[PDB]
Design a protein around this ligand. Structure first.
Ligand SMILES: [Zn+2]
Lengths: 37, 68, 180, 132, 138, 181
RNA sequence: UAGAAGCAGCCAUACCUUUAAAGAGUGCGUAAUAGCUCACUGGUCGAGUACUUAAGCGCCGAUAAUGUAACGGGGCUAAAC
């Protein structure tokens, strides 16, 4: 959704992971999902 | 309510908005002691000084200047 | 590394475990499961228990430590107690029925979905809106439950769809929640 | 970063030792699920009975008891356990514990009366026993 | 804006700016400073953008000191012209900053809030920065 | 007492390139002057200096030991690069260890004052106080709690609770350090 | 303020207390509450964990048109540094 270049946690429940070579944010608040461009 | 009792005692009807600076009145030491003794039923303190301190803290939160 | 990698593995009496040439066989009351183990990790059976360690301390080995510990543990818990993951079908006119080794799903689509059940896995019904997949392998059980859920993923406006029982669906509102 | 923790732990050990030396009889209660109101009422009853009930760290209490020659089973410290010291009415404290066990889920895990490690049965018998 | 109110000469030659800073490189009037990690020019207007950011983040907690003043004209020839006549005209003002210039100084607020505000300021400047506490007091 | 001791050894390099090489070897060039002696050129361990005196003030005093002698020195100067957190020279002013001397020492304000709580006005008239002691006992900074200081109260210089062998030196003993009006 | 009960918003939490420990309540959601949770603390288990700084290689950022086309190519995990 927020295919950005700076991916940061938005709330304290967001969590940072790295998948197949891209940096991603995963959270319960699906509105907070992210991946680095 | 302790706020209601203190407002009645000191003539306070509407709580002062700036309770930190805009004092709405003075809470006398003897009146605070009497109010704490009266309301000790609902207060879980074991010391009359502790009950009076609870009353005084409530008065400060309402904006009433503590009585010296 | 971390304590899950080193935590010892208890062996139930009815369950037998054996290690040989980068392979592990776990034979229990309900079945037999096999696993590959990589070279950098060593698995030992002693005193009716399973232990795992690493020849090296590269990070691949660090991760492998926990990975294989957990797998063998789930490999032993399966052969003793079996794995089971359940599902609920919620929605108007949604139904599930069973014939032999296949399930028939009525999920609003203009066609009634047939579903072959892969071998090694059993399916249990509770009326026509509750399912429970049981089997020897946790991986397979999860796979089947997931693929069934994908048949009709849930939705947030009314809870309709096929949900995991343990799952909590976040819910939105439609018309009347926006009432002014 | 560790001197402050050492100081806090030392102060806790000193306070607990003062309580343990002032208490003639002692007991440990597992009060898991004992609500805030239930705990407040039980503490008020203990205070009225002259006992002092409070939560003490298991490791600190075990070390302090080992120093003070308290050879009890560590199962008493297993589980969130409030230590209640009663020096005068051991029968009253045990009866209050039994009443709390009836009216809630609190259990009297361990007891130590006159240096005697009272198990579940001995503790229940003592609690049912009356005062002097 | 920030700009000198009177100049001897309206236009001056663009030097080459280089080397670290040997002066104005220490925290003087405050508690926390925003040192630069590059050598470059900071315009007056980026200066005031960073100042707004800091000041607005600080709810009256303390004071902000600006340790640079532009005083350097930046000329630009008209839009569509050739290379002929010479030294077109002042457009905006630049300040010189070198690696190690304190550039900004803050007083009064807790260290966490200062660090936040001053990253908020650094987001609007054209140079890498570093937030420094006095490193000899706390 | 160790935390006031500092190990050095002599250097004979004396060049810009030489000093750069030393700091690459993670040491700090330093010089010691005072008491009419010949200047002593030495070098210090950067890790040790950082660990011990990460908060050094103009009034910090310490002991230098070259394995063969002891010196009582003030940190007169320290050339710091802020960007790289890099010390790259130290000036040590030596004093006599047994000669009473004066020095302005800053104050450190602690506690929340009742007067300011109730509407007092901080006015920090004095940011430092002239004290007197032997060098090894000079206070790094003198503390002052304002909590009992109510409205309309000023702080007398004698009111400053002082370390053991430290003594006031101000000509005006009754001047006020901080007032709350 | 019409409703603020911790969560439109304002002043501070110089409110003590039974104090395990509990902020004038962290978030979600409630017209306002309710309700569900957090900080904090107790047990279980058992030593590194939690946040930064310096140096060497890295990742995304990285993206134009005749055809891979930014090691010469084949290829190389060193045949790289
Ligand atoms: Zn989130």
């Amino acid at each position: 959704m927020k295919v950005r270049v700076s991916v940061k946690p938005i709330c304290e429940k967001c969590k940072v992971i790295k998948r197949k070579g891209v940096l991603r944010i995963i959270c319960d608040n699906l509105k907070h999902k992210q991946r680095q461009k | 309510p302790a706020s209601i009792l203190i407002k009645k005692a000191i003539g306070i009807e509407s709580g002062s908005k700036k309770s930190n600076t805009d004092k709405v009145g003075t809470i006398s030491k003897e009146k605070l002691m009497e109010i704490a003794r009266i309301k000790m039923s609902d207060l879980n303190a074991k010391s009359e000084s502790a009950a009076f301190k609870i009353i005084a803290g409530s008065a400060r939160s309402m904006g009433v200047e503590v009585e010296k | 590394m971390s304590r899950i990698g080193r935590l010892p593995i208890k062996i139930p009496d009815a369950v037998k475990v054996d290690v040989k040439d980068n392979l592990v066989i776990v034979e229990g009351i309900r079945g037999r499961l096999v696993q590959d183990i990589k070279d950098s990790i060593n698995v030992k059976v002693e005193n009716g228990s399973v232990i795992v360690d690493r020849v090296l301390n590269d990070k691949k080995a660090k991760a492998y430590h926990g990975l294989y510990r957990s797998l063998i543990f789930n490999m032993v818990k399966g052969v003793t107690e079996g794995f089971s993951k359940s599902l609920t079908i919620n929605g108007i006119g949604y139904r599930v029925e069973q014939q032999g080794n296949s399930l028939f799903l009525s999920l609003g689509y203009s066609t009634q979905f047939e579903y072959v059940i892969p071998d090694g896995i059993s399916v249990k019904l509770d009326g026509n809106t509750k399912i429970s997949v049981e089997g020897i392998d946790k991986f397979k059980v999860g796979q089947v439950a997931a693929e069934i859920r994908s048949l009709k993923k849930p939705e947030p406006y009314k809870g309709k769809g096929i949900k995991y029982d343990n799952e909590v669906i976040r819910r939105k509102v439609g018309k009347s929640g926006v009432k002014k | 970063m560790s001197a402050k923790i050492n100081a806090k732990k030392l102060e806790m050990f000193d306070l607990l030792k003062q309580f343990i030396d002032s208490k003639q009889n002692l007991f440990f209660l597992d009060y898991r699920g004992l609500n805030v109101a239930q705990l407040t009422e039980l503490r008020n009853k203990i205070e009225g009975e002259h006992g002092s009930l409070k939560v003490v760290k298991n490791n600190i209490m075990k070390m302090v008891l080992k120093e003070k020659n308290i050879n009890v089973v560590d199962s008493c410290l297993v589980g969130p356990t409030v230590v209640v010291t009663a020096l005068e009415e051991a029968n009253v404290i045990a009866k209050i514990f039994y009443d709390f066990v009836k009216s809630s889920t609190l259990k009297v895990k361990g007891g130590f009366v006159l240096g005697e490690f009272y198990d579940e049965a001995k503790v229940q018998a003592y609690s049912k026993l009356p005062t002097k | 804006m920030l700009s000198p109110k009177k100049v001897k000469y309206r236009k001056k030659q663009r030097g080459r700016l280089s080397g670290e800073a040997q002066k104005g490189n220490k925290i003087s009037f405050g508690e926390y400073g925003l040192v630069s990690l590059e050598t470059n020019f900071i315009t007056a207007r980026q200066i005031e953008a960073a100042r707004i950011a800091m000041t607005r983040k600080i709810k009256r907690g303390g004071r902000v000191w600006i340790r640079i003043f532009p005083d350097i004209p930046y000329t630009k020839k008209p839009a569509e012209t050739r290379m002929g006549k010479g030294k077109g005209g002042v457009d905006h003002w630049n300040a010189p900053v070198k690696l190690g210039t304190v550039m900004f100084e803050m007083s009064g607020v807790v260290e966490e809030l200062a660090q936040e505000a001053m990253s908020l300021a650094s987001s609007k400047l054209p140079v890498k920065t570093m937030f420094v506490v006095r490193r000899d007091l706390r | 007492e160790n935390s006031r001791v500092l190990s050095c050894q002599y250097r004979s390099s004396f060049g810009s390139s030489n000093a750069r090489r030393i700091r690459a070897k993670s040491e700090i060039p330093a010089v010691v002057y005072g008491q009419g002696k010949d200047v002593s050129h030495l070098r210090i361990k950067s890790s040790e200096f950082n660990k011990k005196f990460a908060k050094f003030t103009d009034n910090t005093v310490l002991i230098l030991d070259d394995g063969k002698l002891e010196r009582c020195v003030f940190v007169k100067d320290a050339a710091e690069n802020i960007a790289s957190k890099l010390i790259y020279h130290i000036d040590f002013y030596e004093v006599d260890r047994n000669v009473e001397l004066e020095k302005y020492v800053p104050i450190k304000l602690i506690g929340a004052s009742i007067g300011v709580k109730e509407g007092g006005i901080l006015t920090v008239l004095k940011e430092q106080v002239k004290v007197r002691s032997l060098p090894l006992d000079l206070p790094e900074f003198i503390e002052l709690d304002l909590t009992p200081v109510n409205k309309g109260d000023s702080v007398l210089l004698k009111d400053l609770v002082l370390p053991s062998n430290v003594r006031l030196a101000e000509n005006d003993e009754n001047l006020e350090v901080v007032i709350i009006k």
